[PDB]
Design an enzyme around this catalytic site. Structure first.
Site, PDB file in Angstrom:
ATOM      1  CD  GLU A 729      -3.343   0.007   0.239  1.00  0.00           C
ATOM      2  OE1 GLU A 729      -3.026   0.776  -0.693  1.00  0.00           O
ATOM      3  OE2 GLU A 729      -4.522  -0.129   0.628  1.00  0.00           O
ATOM      4  CG  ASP A 730       0.403   3.830  -2.069  1.00  0.00           C
ATOM      5  OD1 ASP A 730       0.147   2.825  -2.764  1.00  0.00           O
ATOM      6  OD2 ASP A 730      -0.395   4.779  -1.923  1.00  0.00           O
ATOM      7  CB  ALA A 731       4.729   1.007   2.664  1.00  0.00           C
ATOM      8  N   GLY A 870       5.320   7.350  -0.536  1.00  0.00           N
ATOM      9  CA  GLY A 870       4.967   6.463   0.559  1.00  0.00           C
ATOM     10  C   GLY A 870       5.924   6.620   1.719  1.00  0.00           C
ATOM     11  NE  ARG A 902       0.371   3.934  -6.848  1.00  0.00           N
ATOM     12  CZ  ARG A 902      -0.675   3.890  -6.033  1.00  0.00           C
ATOM     13  NH1 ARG A 902      -1.776   4.583  -6.276  1.00  0.00           N
ATOM     14  NH2 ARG A 902      -0.613   3.136  -4.940  1.00  0.00           N
TER      15      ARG A 902
END
Ligand SMILES: [Zn+2]
Ligand SMILES: [Zn+2]
Lengths: 1103, 65, 78
Positions: A729-731, A870, A902
């Site tokens: 999750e974008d981390a 992130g 994206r």
DNA sequence: GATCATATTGTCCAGACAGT
DNA sequence: ACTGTCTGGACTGGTCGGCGCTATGATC
């Protein structure tokens, strides 16, 4: 001859940026305002007539001196921007206006008296940094790479964001679908006053005119008669002569035939404006309203009133044609109808307001002096009398305050903002920022969306998020803004070229109308020939490049527009004739050799500036190899349509538009060596990267912009791989050894200020260590870092609530109070520097800059240049990180799920280019549309001994086994943002409360609480947790107990001295009960009682 | 503002050979061959040496005391 | 007065003849005379001499509905 | 010089209202 | 009984950080 290459056009664009710069609009606008704007305002005001019989004072020439400051002692010394920033002084220069007293009609000796201080734009013609070299700026404590173009007010940098307003004195026509009417509006400007004159045609065919400070729209025929025309025929041909227009006019004056004279229409206007008033009072009120509100840009004298009717007629046609299909509705968002108010125009308006108030103050001063002293003292020395009746500060405190709070006269607000100093990109973006007067909460579908006229003028991607999207834009890299030129010379040139004046020849269907800055000046027989002649003269250098000519040739109407005013955003285009561009290889060679400059190229007409109006007649070619015979212009740099932060993104055409927008927005939030003089600066918050790096995949414009000299990030060896779910999750996952080796290390500086303020009666603050006997003593250990003068020692470790400057305040209405400046409770660090100086009032000022080392950790925000952002999910040790067969351990690990969702292929291309650049040693160009092709990059990666796709065989760091999939690892420029977890963590258990609502305070600086909003209460109700909601909203925020009388429900009064509780409105010393409720409810009851509302609390037993 | 002592990826020392690399780059030679002869083979160390820009000389001019 | 000329193709979709169209305004507008000349609709005035009343009666013909229901615009079949 | 009374009076949706 | 017009109200929440303002012309 070859068809040229984009490298030559890039060289030409680089020469253009070197000659002009990136803050040219601010500097040019301020120079124009200084050269004549003050003189224009002074001449507009003219003279001041006080209450003195047969005497007046007229204004002469006004000049501005060098920036100087006068101390409290009285010594005048030269002022520098660094000194103004450090000492919290306004960087301003005195304004000297000569005054010529007039006695009995005979002019006297002029008196030169300073009228105030005007703030000085940085690096302007009136600034001390003009013409200085890099060494001279270094010796003055100024960064040579600083573009200037801003103001320093009270030691804080202020930047004036440009305003995208409508074109003044221009009529725009549109149709309201809901109202079923055709409406035309003009914003007439006069001396900073804007009047919205409206002409509408409803479904009944009648025409109404809307005038400001008028509560109801009155008929167009009534104003037309009251403006000077008496007979019906005058109104008949005051508009046009087309038979349909004539018949519409006949219907209009047949419907409005009840009024035939001027007096009746003026009586109607006065009655509508001021009902219930005498007839002559209404008459004079209507006359004043018509003079000062009905098209003020045409004048205020009644003599031009008839001409105003002519300006009404050109409005009516614009209303009529759209109501009959002769002409189409013009676009309100078209940049031909949009002007850009720069800092010069707003400064002119502010100076006009301040000078008018200063003039009225001086008039009152001379009136009072003449009434007190008499005629003997007034006329015995007219030089001293005028000078002593002037208060310059009255002007000055109106100007700089408008440059301090950002509030402008006339209801305009947010004009001046604090200059962003996060990095090099943010300051340039703020200096090239354009706002809109539209409300942020309003859904503006037709205004927020990108327009086709924004090509080369407005950056298509760099826009803010949220309510500011669309309404706030940034100037394009090739955007050029015009400078004012004398319109009389342009009008004389147009008349001498063959344009018949309007007063000599009436408009005809077979004649081309000629418009100058939105004002019709006449008609010509051959509009195309006139346009071609004007363009040829502009290309020959006979006339200035500011003049732009356009021709609109429709089947119904034909018009010619000439624009030479301010606020027009233009772009440079290479003139192409007969399929051959004017720019040849010889011009490029001269540009490269330095013999030819950009202004020289403009002079010969090879490259010309085109606004939105002229470009309607142009056919531009994107590439030098796509030019044809029908092409009229050639694009200089297609990559220059982006803004300054948007050009930082490598290969923006390979990324999604929201991703490019996010990357452009986050380029201003990165940390790096923005300024070389950061250590001596006194910015309240600042960030520094320990080892900033220029990206290996960078656009060529970034070298010209200056980002390579002031980088704001580092190149990260990023491998795209799923690692234990901590990059989910974008981390992102960072290497512990890389962090320990100094990668992405940052330092955060915070500056605190302490002033030894002087109060009334001689009381003043003292800089000393407070004694323990006085009240407010924080603690013995809190002053352990203080010296004997009350100032903290440099290079001293500090913690939360640690005293930096020991200050003592005089008591209110006892011992001296404690007002020491302390570090924030949630912040710490080491004291970097201490500066001791004086303010403008001579009081002592101590500025302490404290630096804190920010080692990257969990929660720290890192972002790529393609919108991939992130927080750090895990600090993985190097032994646990995977490594490739070539012996490369990634410095960062990103989740593979975020790349294709994206649509971010530019990130992969940048990784390939970074790996290629690292392996070959040559920097990879990432410019838009002219960058290194991806396939070529894969080819050289293959030739370097690596896989084409960039995938490498990696081994697991824990198990030690080979991974079954080849992992894509490459060099991606990753920048650390200022949204660090150190400054974002807040934790409050109990502490200070608000004095009003008895609720926790706001924010983190004062140990405030966390807001439990309405939505949180709603979801707690939905969860069914009644007692949890009671504990949250009541038992933890504002729990209190009150005394309530059971007889009447009023709040009973408890007297501690008497020791008894009783109801004053009722009595009832026995039936009083204690009720537990929120203090906010008690405040609401008090508000209701103050609003003459009686709430009666009917108490009930708990069981 | 100053060249890092070690490479951020593997800790290989690069500050010793950075100034020689910068001097050879200004002489017109190919930086790839300069890195090759200086022992900088892994592209992470090459990343550290190439992407670094010297800025301390512009910070020393602003005295702080 | 208005001399109305209408395209026949649209009349091929409304499913009615021009003469019956006249019947929709003869009874409704008793102050004016309606005449049909092939595919052209021509109106005649009984007592009209001012331009003001012409603009107060020309729009009433347009606002009048020949067939169907009031407030009905587009119509499609699926 | 140090004090002191006064300091001006953008759109859209829904409900109520003259007009025909 | 309809119809266009005048008047009134609301415009997602939260958070980080900053900037700046909240007297004056007579009177002894
Ligand atoms: Zn009571
Ligand atoms: Zn390495």
């Amino acid at each position: 001859e070859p068809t040229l290459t984009p490298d030559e056009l890039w060289l030409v664009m680089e020469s253009y940026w070197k000659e002009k710069g990136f803050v040219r609009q601010h500097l040019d606008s301020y120079n124009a305002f200084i050269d004549h704007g003050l003189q224009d305002v002074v001449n507009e005001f003219g003279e001041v007539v006080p209450d003195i019989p047969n005497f007046k004072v007229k204004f002469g020439k006004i000049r501005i001196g060098q920036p100087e400051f006068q101390e409290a002692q009285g010594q005048r010394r030269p002022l520098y921007p660094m000194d103004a920033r450090i000492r919290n002084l306004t960087y301003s220069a005195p304004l000297y206006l000569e005054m010529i007293p007039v006695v009995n009609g005979i002019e006297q000796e002029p008196v030169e008296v300073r009228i105030g201080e005007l703030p000085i734009m940085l690096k302007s013609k009136a600034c001390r940094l003009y013409g200085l070299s890099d060494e001279e700026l270094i010796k003055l404590g100024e960064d040579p790479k600083d573009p200037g173009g801003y103001f320093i007010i009270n030691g804080s940098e202020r930047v004036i964001v440009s305003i995208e307003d409508l074109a003044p004195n221009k009529t725009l026509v549109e149709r309201d679908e809901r109202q079923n009417k055709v409406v035309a509006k003009v914003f007439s400007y006069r001396h900073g006053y804007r009047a919205l004159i409206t002409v509408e045609r409803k479904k009944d065919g009648i025409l109404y005119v809307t005038i400001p400070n008028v509560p109801k729209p009155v008929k167009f025929v009534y104003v037309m008669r009251a403006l000077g025309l008496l007979t019906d025929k005058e109104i008949v041909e005051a508009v046009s002569d087309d038979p349909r227009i004539q018949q519409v006019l006949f219907d209009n004056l047949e419907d409005a035939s009840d009024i035939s004279t001027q007096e009746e229409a003026l009586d109607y206007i006065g009655r509508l404006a001021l009902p219930g008033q005498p007839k002559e009072y209404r008459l004079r009120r209507a006359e004043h309203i018509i003079d000062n509100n009905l098209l003020p840009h045409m004048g205020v004298d009644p003599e031009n009133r008839r001409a105003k009717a002519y300006y009404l007629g050109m409005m009516a046609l614009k209303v009529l044609e759209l109501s009959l299909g002769l002409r189409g509705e013009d676009d309100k968002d078209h940049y031909a109808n949009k002007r850009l108010k720069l800092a010069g125009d707003l400064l002119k308006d502010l100076f006009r307001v301040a000078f008018g108030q200063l003039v009225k103050d001086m008039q009152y001063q001379m009136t009072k002096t003449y009434q007190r002293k008499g005629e003997r003292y007034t006329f015995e020395n007219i030089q001293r009398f005028v000078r002593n009746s002037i208060r310059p500060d009255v002007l000055s405190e109106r100007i700089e305050h408008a440059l301090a709070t950002g509030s402008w006269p006339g209801g305009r607000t947010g004009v001046s903002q604090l200059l962003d100093r996060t990095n090099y990109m943010s300051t340039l973006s703020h200096l090239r920022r354009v706002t809109s007067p539209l409300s942020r909460d309003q859904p503006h579908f037709e205004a927020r969306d990108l327009h086709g006229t924004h090509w080369g003028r407005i950056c298509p991607t760099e826009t803010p998020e949220g309510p500011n999207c669309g309404l706030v834009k940034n100037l394009a890299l090739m955007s050029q803004i015009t400078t004012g030129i004398p319109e009389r010379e342009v009008r004389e040139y147009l008349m001498k070229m063959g344009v018949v004046p309007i007063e000599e020849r009436r408009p005809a269907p077979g004649l081309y109308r000629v418009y100058l800055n939105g004002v019709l000046i006449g008609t010509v027989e051959d509009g195309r020939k006139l346009v071609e002649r004007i363009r040829a003269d502009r290309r020959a250098g006979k006339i200035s490049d500011v003049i732009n000519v356009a021709l609109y040739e429709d089947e119904e109407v034909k018009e010619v527009y000439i624009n030479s005013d301010d606020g027009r955003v233009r772009r440079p285009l290479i003139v192409v004739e007969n399929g051959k561009p004017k720019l040849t290889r010889e011009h490029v060679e001269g540009i490269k050799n330095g013999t030819l400059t950009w202004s020289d190229l403009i002079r010969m007409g090879v490259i010309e500036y085109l606004d939105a109006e002229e470009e309607e007649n142009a056919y531009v070619a994107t590439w030098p190899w796509e030019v044809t015979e029908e092409h009229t212009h050639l694009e200089l740099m297609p990559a220059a349509i982006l803004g300054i932060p948007a050009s930082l993104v490598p290969y923006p055409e390979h990324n999604a538009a929201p991703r490019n927008t996010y990357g452009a927005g986050m380029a201003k939030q990165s940390l790096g060596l923005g300024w070389a003089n950061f250590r001596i600066r006194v910015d309240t918050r600042g960030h520094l990267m320990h080892y900033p790096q220029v990206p290996l995949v960078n656009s060529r414009i970034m070298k010209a912009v200056g980002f390579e000299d002031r980088p704001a990030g580092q190149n990260f060896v990023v491998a795209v791989l799923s690692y234990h779910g901590y990059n989910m999750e974008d981390a992102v996952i960072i290497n512990k050894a890389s962090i320990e080796r100094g990668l992405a290390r940052s330092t955060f500086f915070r500056t605190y200020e302490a002033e030894e303020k002087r109060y009334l009666g001689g009381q003043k603050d003292n800089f000393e260590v407070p004694s323990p006997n006085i009240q407010g003593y924080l603690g013995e250990k809190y002053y352990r870092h203080l010296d004997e003068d009350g100032l903290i020692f440099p290079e001293s470790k500090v913690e939360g609530k640690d005293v930096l400057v020991g200050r003592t305040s005089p008591p209110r209405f006892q011992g001296r109070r404690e007002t020491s400046v302390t570090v924030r409770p949630s912040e710490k660090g080491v004291v970097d520097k201490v500066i001791v100086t004086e303010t403008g009032d001579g009081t002592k000022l101590v500025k302490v800059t404290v630096r804190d080392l920010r080692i990257p950790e969990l929660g720290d925000k890192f972002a790529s240049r393609h919108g991939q952002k992130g927080v750090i999910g895990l600090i993985v040790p190097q032994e646990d990180m995977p490594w490739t067969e070539s012996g490369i351990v990634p410095d960062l690990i990103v989740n593979p799920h975020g790349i294709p969702s994206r649509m971010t292929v530019g990130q992969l291309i940048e990784a390939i280019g970074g790996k290629v650049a690292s392996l070959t040693g040559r920097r990879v160009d990432g410019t838009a549309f002219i960058g290194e092709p991806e396939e070529k990059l894969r080819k050289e990666l293959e030739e370097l001994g690596f896989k084409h796709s960039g995938r490498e065989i990696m081994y697991d760091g824990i198990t030690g086994r080979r991974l079954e999939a080849d992992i894509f690892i490459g060099v991606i420029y990753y920048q650390r943002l200022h949204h660090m977890v150190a400054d974002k963590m807040h934790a409050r258990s109990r502490g200070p409360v608000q004095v009003l609502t008895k609720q926790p305070t706001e924010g983190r600086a004062r140990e405030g609480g966390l807001r439990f909003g309405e939505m949180e209460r709603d979801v707690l109700i939905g969860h069914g947790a009644a007692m949890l909601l009671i504990e949250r909203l009541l038992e933890e925020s504002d729990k209190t107990e009150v005394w309530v009388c059971e007889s009447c429900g009023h709040l009973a009064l408890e007297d501690k001295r008497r020791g008894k509780v009783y109801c004053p409105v009722c009595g009832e010393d026995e039936r009083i009960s204690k009720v537990e409720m929120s203090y906010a409810f008690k405040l609401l009851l008090d508000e209701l009682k103050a609003m003459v509302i009686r709430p009666s609390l009917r108490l009930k037993d708990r069981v | 503002m100053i060249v890092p002592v070690r490479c951020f990826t593997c800790g290989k020392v690069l500050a010793d050979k950075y100034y020689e690399f910068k001097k050879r780059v200004e002489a017109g030679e190919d930086p790839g061959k300069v890195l090759d002869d200086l022992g900088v083979e892994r592209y992470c160390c090459r990343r550290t040496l190439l992407s670094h820009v010297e800025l301390i000389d512009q910070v020393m001019v602003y005295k702080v005391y | 007065e208005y001399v109305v000329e209408i395209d026949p193709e649209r009349l091929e979709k409304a499913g009615l003849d021009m003469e019956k169209v006249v019947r929709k305004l003869t009874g409704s507008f008793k102050s004016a005379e309606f005449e049909a000349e092939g595919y052209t609709l021509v109106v005649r005035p009984k007592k009209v001499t001012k331009l003001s009343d012409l603009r107060k009666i020309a729009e009433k013909v347009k606002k009048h509905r020949l067939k169907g229901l009031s407030g009905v615009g587009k119509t499609i079949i699926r």
